[PDB]
Design a protein around this ligand. Structure first.
Ligand code: NI
Length: 81
């Protein structure tokens, strides 16, 4: 394995950050195509892109960095909010 495509890089970085969850019921994230993800208990699909090496998640009309999205949504990260 060699990360080469944007889809590959995004998926690796989503994996790295989601793996930091400490919840009893882990915050689940699934790749649904090269550019859409399902996060946590929400069934909503979100676009995900990489821009200058930062992964961003589509949220209400704009883009939010992945780390901030996880702070806002993964219960074990709420103390960063
Ligand atoms: Ni968590």
């Amino acid at each position: 394995y060699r990360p080469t495509t944007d889809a590959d890089k995004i998926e690796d970085e989503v994996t790295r950050q989601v793996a930091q969850c400490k919840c009893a019921k882990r915050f689940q994230v699934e790749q649904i195509g090269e550019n859409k993800y399902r996060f946590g208990d929400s069934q909503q699909l979100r676009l995900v892109r990489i821009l200058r090496s930062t992964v961003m998640v589509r949220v209400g009309g704009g883009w939010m960095a992945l780390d901030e999205f996880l702070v806002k949504n993964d219960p074990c990260r709420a103390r960063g909010r």
